Structure formats: C-alpha cells, structure tokens
Amino acid sequence: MQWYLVAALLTILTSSQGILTTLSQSNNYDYATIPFLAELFKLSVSGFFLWKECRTSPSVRMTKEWRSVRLYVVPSVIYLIHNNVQFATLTYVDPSTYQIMGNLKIVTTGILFRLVLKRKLSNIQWMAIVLLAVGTTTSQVKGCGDSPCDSLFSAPLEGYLLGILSACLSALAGVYTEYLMKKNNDSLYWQNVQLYTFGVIFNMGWLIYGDFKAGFELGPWWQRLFNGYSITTWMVVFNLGSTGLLVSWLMKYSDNIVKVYSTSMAMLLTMVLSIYLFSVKATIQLFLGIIICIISLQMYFMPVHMLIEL
Amino acid sequence: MQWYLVAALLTILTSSQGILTTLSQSNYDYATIPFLAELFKLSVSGFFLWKECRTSPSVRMTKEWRSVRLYVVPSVIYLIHNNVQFATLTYVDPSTYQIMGNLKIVTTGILFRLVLKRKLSNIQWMAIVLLAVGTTTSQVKGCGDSPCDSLFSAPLEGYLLGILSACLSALAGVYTEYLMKKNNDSLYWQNVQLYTFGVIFNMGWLIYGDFKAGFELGPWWQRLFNGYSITTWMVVFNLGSTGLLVSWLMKYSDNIVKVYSTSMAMLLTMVLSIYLFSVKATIQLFLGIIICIISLQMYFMPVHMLIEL
Ligand SMILES: Nc1ccn([C@@H]2O[C@H](COP(=O)(O)O)[C@@H](O)[C@H]2O)c(=O)n1
Numbered sequence: 001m002q003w004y005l006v007a008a009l010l011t012i013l014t015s016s017q018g019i020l021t022t023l024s025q026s027n028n029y030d031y032a033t034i035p036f037l038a039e040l041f042k043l044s045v046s047g048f049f050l051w052k053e054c055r056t057s058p059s060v061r062m063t064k065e066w067r068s069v070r071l072y073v074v075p076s077v078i079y080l081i082h083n084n085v086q087f088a089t090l091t092y093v094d095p096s097t098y099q100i101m102g103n104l105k106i107v108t109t110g111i112l113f114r115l116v117l118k119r120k121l122s123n124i125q126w127m128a129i130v131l132l133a134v135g136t137t138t139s140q141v142k143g144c145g146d147s148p149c150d151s152l153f154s155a156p157l158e159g160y161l162l163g164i165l166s167a168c169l170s171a172l173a174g175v176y177t178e179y180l181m182k183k184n185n186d187s188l189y190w191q192n193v194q195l196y197t198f199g200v201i202f203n204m205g206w207l208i209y210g211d212f213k214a215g216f217e218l219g220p221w222w223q224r225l226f227n228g229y230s231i232t233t234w235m236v237v238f239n240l241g242s243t244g245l246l247v248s249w250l251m252k253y254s255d256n257i258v259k260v261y262s263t264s265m266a267m268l269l270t271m272v273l274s275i276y277l278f279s280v281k282a283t284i285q286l287f288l289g290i291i292i293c294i295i296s297l298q299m300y301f302m303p304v305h306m307l308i309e310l
Numbered sequence: 311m312q313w314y315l316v317a318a319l320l321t322i323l324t325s326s327q328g329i330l331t332t333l334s335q336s337n338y339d340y341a342t343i344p345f346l347a348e349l350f351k352l353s354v355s356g357f358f359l360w361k362e363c364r365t366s367p368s369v370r371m372t373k374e375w376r377s378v379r380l381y382v383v384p385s386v387i388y389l390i391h392n393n394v395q396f397a398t399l400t401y402v403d404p405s406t407y408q409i410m411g412n413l414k415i416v417t418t419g420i421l422f423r424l425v426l427k428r429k430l431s432n433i434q435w436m437a438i439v440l441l442a443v444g445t446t447t448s449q450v451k452g453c454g455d456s457p458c459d460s461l462f463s464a465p466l467e468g469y470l471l472g473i474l475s476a477c478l479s480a481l482a483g484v485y486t487e488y489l490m491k492k493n494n495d496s497l498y499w500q501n502v503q504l505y506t507f508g509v510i511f512n513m514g515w516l517i518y519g520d521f522k523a524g525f526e527l528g529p530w531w532q533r534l535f536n537g538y539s540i541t542t543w544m545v546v547f548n549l550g551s552t553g554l555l556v557s558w559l560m561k562y563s564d565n566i567v568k569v570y571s572t573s574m575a576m577l578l579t580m581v582l583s584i585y586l587f588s589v590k591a592t593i594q595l596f597l598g599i600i601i602c603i604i605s606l607q608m609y610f611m612p613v614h615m616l617i618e619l
C-alpha cells in the first residue's frame with residue numbers, strides 16, 4: 001500500500017523471474033508464448049478483482065466511453081513495434097552489446113517523463129537519473145579476459161541507431177501507460193482489464209502472424225502453446241504476471257522513475273545472487289556499479305535537507 | 311589407423327562437443343557454426359590433399375563431372391532434413407523430438423541392407439534394435455520430471471515427420487558411405503568435393519534466410535562472428551574434428567560403427583553430466599547402458615566367443 005514497499009517487492013520479484021528464467025531456460029519450451037500466458041494471467045486476475053470490487057464496493061469508477069477505452073491500444077502498438085526493433089537490432093549486435101544499450105531506457109524515460117508527463121525534475125534528480133544509467137552500464141561492462149570480446153564502438157551503425165530507437169519506444173510505452181492510469185479517476189482493475197485485453201489481442205495476433213509467415217502449413221501456435229512447459233516454466237509465467245501488476249500499480253499510484261529504479265536494482269541483485277548460486281565470478285565492475293547506484297538512489301529519493309546536513 | 315581407435319576417439323569427441331555446446335550455450339548464432347565447421351573440414355582436407363600431392367608419387371582423384379556431381383546429394387538431403395527437423399519441432403517438444411531421434415539407428419540399419427546391400431546376421435539385427443531401444447531407455451522421462459510429455463498424445467504430423475526425419479538422416483549417412491566406397495580415390499579429395507558442396511549449401515541457406523527478411527536486416531556475413539567466445543570456437547573445431555572422423559569411417563569402416571560411436575557418446579555425456587552439471591542419476595541411465603553394452607557385444611563379439619563358456 002506504500003509505494004516504497006511495492007517498489008521493493010517489484011525489485012525482489014523482478015530478480016526472481018530473472019533467475020527462474022535462466023533455470024527454466026536449461027536448454028525446453030517457447031519464450032514466444034510466455035508473454036501471451038503472462039498477459040492472460042494479468043487480464044484474468046484484474047477482471048477477478050474488478051468483479052470482486054463491484055460486488056464489494058458501493059461505487060466503482062469505470063469509463064466505458066470509446067473516446068477513452070480506445071487509448072489503451074497504444075501501449076500494445078508501441079510494444080509490437082518495439083519487439084520488431086529489438087529483433088532487428090540483434091541482427092547487427094551481439095546480445096551483450098544489446099543488453100548494455102538497454103540502460104538508455106533510464107535516460108529516455110527521464111526525458112519523456114519531462115516531455116510527455118510534463119513532470120518536474122531538479123538538477124540533482126537529473127544527475128541521479130544519469131548516474132543510475134551509468135551505474136548499471138558500469139556493472140555490465142565486459143571485464144578483462146571475457147571470452148566474447150565485444151570490440152567496442154566497432155558494431156554497425158544500424159545496431160547503434162536501432163538500440164537507441166528501441167530505448168525511446170520502451171520509454172514511450174511506459175510513460176504513455178502512466179498517462180493512461182493518471183488521466184482517469186478510474187479503478188486500477190478496470191484500467192488493467194482494458195490495457196491487458198488489447199495486450200492479449202496483440203500478443204495473439206503476433207502468434208497468428210508468425211503462423212501466417214509459414215503459410216499455416218506447420219504447427220499452429222495454440223496447439224504448440226503448452227509444449228515443453230515445466231513447473232519452472234509456469235513459475236515465471238506467474239512471476240511475470242505478478243511483476244506486471246505491480247508495474248501497473250506504480251503507473252497509477254507512483255511514477256516511471258520509481259519503476260526504473262526498481263528494475264535497475266533488480267539487475268544488480270540478480271548479479272549478486274548469481275555469485276552464490278550460479279557461482280559467477282564477482283568483479284570490480286559489479287562493486288563499482290552498486291556504489292554508483294546506491295548513491296544515485298540517495299540523490300533522487302533523499303529529502304533535500306538530508307542531502308545538506310552533517 | 312585402426313577403425314576401433316577412430317570409433318573410440320569419435321565417441322570421446324562427440325561427447326566433448328556435446329558438453330562444450332551447452333557450456334557455450336550460456337551468446338551467439340548456432341545457425342553459423344555448421345558453416346564454419348564445414349569451412350574447417352573443407353580447408354583441412356584441402357591442406358592434406360595438397361600435402362599428399364607434394365609428398366606422394368600417385369594420388370587417386372576422379373575429376374570427371376560424372377562422379378563429382380554426386381557429392382551434391384548429401385547436402386540436398388541435409389538441407390531437406392533441416393527443414394523437416396524445424397517442421398517437426400512445431401508439433402513436438404524437443405524432448406519428444408530428441409527421443410524419436412533413436413529411430414535413425416534402425417533406419418541406418420535398414421538402408422545399410424537396402425542401399426549398401428550389406429549382410430547382417432539375425433544376432434546383428436537384434437543388436438541394432440537393442441541399441442535403439444537402449445538409448446531410448448536412457449532418455450525416457452523419469453518420475454517427477456517437470457516437463458511431463460503426455461506420451462502418444464502428440465499430433466500425428468509430429469510423429470510422421472520425426473519418422474521421415476530419421477529416414478533422411480540415415481539416407482544422408484548411407485549415401486556418403488556409398489560415395490567414399492564407390493571410388494578408389496583419396497580420402498582428402500573425396501572430403502574436398504563433399505565439403506565444398508556443404509559450404510555452398512550452408513551458405514545458400516544463410517542467403518535464403520536473409521532473403522526471407524528482404525535483405526533489409528543484418529546480413530549473415532556481417533553477423534557471422536557475433537557473440538563468438540573461445541568456447542564457441544572450441545565447438546567449431548570440435549564439430550569439424552568429429553566430422554573428419556565420420557568421413558574416415560565412411561571410407562574405411564561403415565555407418566553402423568558410426569551410430570555405435572554416436573550412441574555411446576550420448577551415454578557418456580549423461581554419465582559425465584552427473585559429475586559436472588550434477589544431473590540426478592536415474593535407473594533409466596543404468597538400464598540403457600547395460601542394454602547398450604550388451605548390444606555392443608552382440609554386434610561386435612566374434613560369433614565363437616558368443617557361444618563359449
Ligand atoms: N514476444 C513478444 C512479447 C510482447 N509483444 C508485444 O508486447 C505486448 C504485450 O505487452 P507486454 O509484453 O509489454 O505486457 C503485445 O501487444 C505484443 O504486441 C510481442 O510482440 N512479442
């Protein structure tokens with residue numbers, strides 16, 4: 001119920017789906033179908049709570065007018081375009097280069113927060129947003145004697161340009177979602193229901209397109225849907241659903257910058273946990289990135305009188 | 311130089327590329343490795359051919375298009391095979407697909423008799439089957455395995471294509487043996503022709519893939535080295551190595567020695583995965599090994615040793 005508990009919980013669970021994905025990714029299923037099931041989980045859990053809210057509550061705010069309902073399409077259109085850009089990018093860059101260009105969403109959300117959401121940021125705060133992006137990048141940077149030597153700056157221009165466009169779309173999606181939640185006095189569960197309906201539709205249309213690409217002659221998406229699905233596979237479907245509901249909560253009762261701080265701190269926690277479990281070699285880059293990020297946290301969230309005291 | 315040392319070495323190295331693949335499958339494209347692996351074999355064969363011509367008084371080499379053009383066929387089969395493999399996986403989970411893979415043992419068996427016209431005793435036929443049964447046994451999904459593959463409950467297309475896949479797989483191998491043994495030619499010249507067409511077709515595949523997206527995205531040659539770790543290069547060499555041994559066996563041995571090596575590699579991988587990846591040893595592993603060890607004895611044991619005390 002407090003934004004900082006939800007944000008902390010999102011951090012805990014964003015790193016859970018991180019580890020559970022790799023474990024489940026032990027050589028058996030389709031990660032094309034999970035986002036569909038993950039959306040279906042969110043759509044049906046939101047609908048449940050909407051139903052329960054209508055039967056429990058004297059008044060439930062719900063804008064049924066197509067003027068406002070149709071606007072929940074946009075995020076899905078952005079995310080569709082985003083997925084094409086992501087796929088396009090990876091045909092110029094190795095996934096590590098792509099993973100590290102991903103920290104640009106922190107600055108692009110920053111900018112669109114100001115531009116689209118028209119919200120005010122101090123200079124100290126702007127410097128924190130940048131520090132966060134720099135701090136996360138720092139932890140990811142390829143250390144000495146790393147077998148996949150990514151020759152820096154030596155990737156094709158298309159790669160760099162698309163990586164940048166990817167981050168702008170990623171940010172735009174999140175920032176537009178916040179707009180939708182906060183533009184209405186409506187119920188969180190009704191906003192979710194509309195949002196995640198269009199997501200289900202578009203996820204589904206994607207899989208139908210994929211089947212169209214092979215002339216519908218091969219196996220259809222609905223038949224294949226459950227193939228290889230272990231328990232761990234189902235854990236991440238729920239886990240991806242869970243975190244997605246928290247993101248919506250924060251889109252309503254918080255902001256994108258709290259989101260990207262949660263997401264960023266999850267990525268650091270994952271690396272810290274990977275040392276004890278997957279036994280990954282701890283590096284100075286991890287150490288440094290954490291300190292930058294902890295300080296980036298304080299800068300942005302610390303009350304401005306605490307910044308100035310002894 | 312002795313077939314049984316090469317076969318044993320192929321077993322050792324077929325399981326090496328097995329582990330090294332998963333370890334490296336930790337950043338790259340497994341679409342491009344077969345291309346580099348073929349290039350390695352083509353250029354290592356060419357090297358030894360060159361060296362053989364400069365070292366040897368006489369080198370047997372049939373340059374006539376009548377016989378050179380026949381080295382295309384394996385590549386055409388393997389191309390069709392890869393389409394079938396991809397098609398299959400859109401009806402079945404990879405485990406179901408992996409376990410249907412033991413049918414290549416019986417399909418090589420049959421085509422050995424049909425295409426290569428070679429003679430098998432009944433004891434030998436029973437060994438070929440036992441091998442396929444023994445490998446399947448080790449793979450079978452044990453109690454409390456999270457991906458519960460509802461047996462027999464897959465689509466018909468899946469089962470039918472899995473079967474067709476095995477026939478093509480076998481046909482490719484059996485036809486290769488035909489090519490090696492139909493000539494008195496140099497191993498290195500047979501490799502050079504074989505692996506030239508393989509390079510060409512591997513390359514045409516990647517060009518097709520780029521055509522499928524209108525050549526608008528990243529081209530295969532630019533992308534070729536992306537994500538390539540040292541580990542990645544180890545399996546490229548390792549996949550090249552084993553492939554040269556397969557050719558040796560296509561010439562101076564037979565497909566059945568191949569599939570015994572491949573099968574025993576798959577068992578060794580599971581045994582090694584217990585100490586390294588710490589996979590839980592099962593009775594199915596234990597049973598499959600005993601079946602396979604006995605399947606080995608049956609096929610290779612001299613028939614007087616089978617009958618003594
Ligand atoms: N694999 C995926 C995953 C998501 N998407 C897009 O993202 C949207 C789903 O929303 P989220 O995944 O952001 O919850 C869909 O509208 C879909 O177009 C996709 O096109 N391919």
Ligand SMILES: Nc1ccn([C@@H]2O[C@H](COP(=O)(O)O)[C@@H](O)[C@H]2O)c(=O)n1
Pocket residue numbers: 340341344348384385386388389390392507508511512515553
């Ligand atoms: N990923 C792969 C690997 C091989 N192949 C096919 O297999 C042939 C290469 O032979 P090997 O890789 O079996 O030595 C090529 O002609 C190619 O058409 C493919 O089409 N896609």
